[PDB]
Symmetry: D2
Subunit: 255 residues, 4 copies
């Protein structure tokens, strides 16, 4: 039977990376307003702090922390910070990442960078957080991958393969952590209206994108936040190892 409480995050403590803007920001606000206490992390301390204020304005509990996910030291600090501020961790939303389009002949530095952003940071932070969740009797890890993990196109070698690594990591991690009663899932968004997309889109590309999208409109950070809430809520207690695609039923590519 319907139970509104299972759709809420009352008393859960969550860490959210790259939450100063875009998708992460919206996930933070939705989670905080759904009842969770949140640590808003970002490499931009100002942005992270502004999000904290908004959450407080809405009557939520939140703390800011500048954390560059591409640093194992900063990741460890982030975990220590959340535990001292929240007392425990129930949810990890690994949202920060990126990399974007790159030519095949890119320097190896750029290729590896995409792995630092989407894979190594994600795996290490989960290693840091897992013991805490285990002590509390379980938890939920959620990562934001990309449709690029399944799409095939030119100028996407680093971005697409690193996101594909992260998506498969989710399927396998679900096994190692299932015994600790931790669920692991991911969301693969299509084109979502954020500054990240704005830096690479054009009107022509936009029209083409809409041409290949059944529910004709680009995505909004709230579409992703809604999906994140469900996947991290008790309403999805038997959903693990899955990657949910939010795309309006279509595909949006640069080509």
């Amino acid at each position: 039977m319907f139970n509104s409480d299972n759709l809420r995050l009352d008393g859960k403590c969550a860490i959210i990376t790259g939450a100063g803007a875009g998708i992460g920001k919206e996930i933070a606000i939705t989670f905080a307003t759904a009842g969770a206490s949140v640590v808003v992390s970002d490499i931009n301390a100002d942005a992270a702090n502004h999000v904290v204020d908004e959450i407080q304005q809405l009557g939520g509990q939140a703390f800011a922390c500048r954390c560059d996910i591409t640093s194992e030291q900063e990741l460890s600090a982030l975990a220590d910070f959340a535990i001292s501020k929240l007392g425990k961790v129930d949810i990890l939303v690994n949202n920060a990442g990126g990399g974007g389009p790159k030519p095949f002949d890119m320097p190896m530095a750029d290729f590896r960078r995409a792995y630092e952003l989407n894979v190594f940071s994600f795996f290490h932070l989960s290693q840091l957080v897992a013991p805490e969740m285990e002590k509390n009797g379980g938890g939920v890890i959620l990562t934001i991958t990309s449709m690029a993990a399944e799409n095939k196109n030119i100028n996407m070698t680093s971005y697409a393969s690193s996101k594909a690594a992260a998506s498969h990591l989710v399927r396998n991690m679900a096994f190692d952590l299932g015994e600790k009663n931790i669920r692991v899932n991911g969301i693969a968004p299509g084109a979502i209206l954020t500054d990240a997309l704005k830096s690479v889109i054009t009107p022509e590309i936009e029209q083409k994108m809409l041409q290949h999208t059944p529910i004709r409109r680009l995505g909004q950070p709230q579409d992703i936040a809604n999906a994140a809430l469900f996947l991290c809520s008790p309403a999805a207690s038997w959903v693990s190892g899955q990657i949910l695609t939010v795309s309006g039923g279509g595909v949006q590519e640069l080509n």
Copy 2:
């Protein structure tokens, strides 16, 4: 930001096939109690009526329809009855299906039956409902497929291939119906405790299933009803052409 009303079906009218028991029943009760007026269809009239009583007592709005999904005539009858009783149709939950394990040398009647149950019925009911939804400016169609659509094992030719067809129909129908502003998704359940699972499961099989499921337990009709609620709710307005697997992160097979 979180909005509890975006996770409800207030003022929505839904048709649910095979709602007399198991997963179908749970979806019917969960939807009614989340605000939707429900038409409970099932081949077993007594079961349909019982569910309708359970809903009304819960303060819900529901009607019963003895419909055999494998009959073109009874499908359009179901369609007519629902629009007359409910006034409109916003949601179609194609749950009824089946078939099960069968030996390679089964009569062609058996092989074809799986397709009558999981494919032709589904497709035809959608054609019947789509014009109504189009007239209203939108709607949602959800079908219950199965992990069999992705698993490979012995004695599963008819069941697995017909569910695979239903899953791929979902990805393509999303394109055709997207123009009418209709979303189409499916849920692929793993081992769910219903009379159906109970008819082929043995304690030896259960143990194997569990040893291959990270979130160690068998699914429950409620796990599927929760996912169905989300997929059919306004919170999933940009989710289409997707199949969500509810499996505890593992795989439950008979072999």
Copy 3:
């Protein structure tokens, strides 16, 4: 070490459906010239007979049979004919099929037709042929599916879902028949230059298709025949349940 004999079909007897033209014709000629005796079946007896002549001109062994794959009676006759002419069956190449683009509101007759052509015929013929292969100690079944089994687009509900059923049938049949030492595989071609494609393509559609194909050219029946040979040869003795896609690395769609 390299062994040219493992790439040949010396002394094998093969049945090939829809072999009067296009892909099937080329598979027949390549198989016959690789050492196999072949039964060339088609609904067009004249076309089937012309292929037989060409094979004989090339010095191969071949027999023609008019067989409408959408008739269980004609399928049974085809199996009886091949056994009386060849004495045994080692290989079945289920190539006939089709259906093409259809609007969502197509008559149910058209939707079912695609299943008759791509699924039911394929399954029944395999049931007919399996015992023969079993008596000879094994065999190989190969079906020609389509990239439509994975592609998503409008006006493809019947075609795409029926091909998806056939592809998953292959993955599951491999299990039932593995015990009889029969391998089962499929080939999913992209756009191949045949009259079937010619009936639906246009210059604009052609350019677009080439725009999305890395190895820039449309496919030829020989590309498919080459793949068919490998998959049915002793060189692929441990390849079963697979679907090989021949597409130039791209995707060719009507939209």
Copy 4:
């Protein structure tokens, strides 16, 4: 029509990494005996030299190169040595890789090592070779990934996710290199009898593997060499961006 010469590598020059043993060795011998001049690279010099002798005795043309794929410096050295010895490079077989099962709490060095082995090396060697192939008007790149790229199980995070990245890199690289007229494919082997499999397999595990494999037997290096020959031959001129699984139609896992 059949043409034995289209299945050979006469006059082609190939670089094969990890060719000192197992799958790599078999590919080297099979390619040399099908007509190609081969550069056998391996970290183990003695093994590389031995293979070179075996080939020459078979009347083949080969050279040895002690290359550690995990070194950017040794990779460009390998590239330079091959173009100097062979004169040109037409085929690159990226075979060397590894990593294996690892616990979730493994040192980050271990997690990163799998990526050095299966991803960064592969990508960088391809960048080094692509210009040569482009100059000649074409070439072929083949990488040996693994069924781990699709399987999900415990103790496989590093190995499975890095192989998943290598497989997706293949699908995307096909686009970038297609313009240079270069085809890119991969082969995902199941359980193959090599010293590597022998280091983690136990008679109890073998039996389980076999009970889940329709074509009941474990793979052999030759099964992979046969598939590699085909994918790198003119017979596969329109096959790109694909991963061919050689698995006996089943799944072989450690759990």
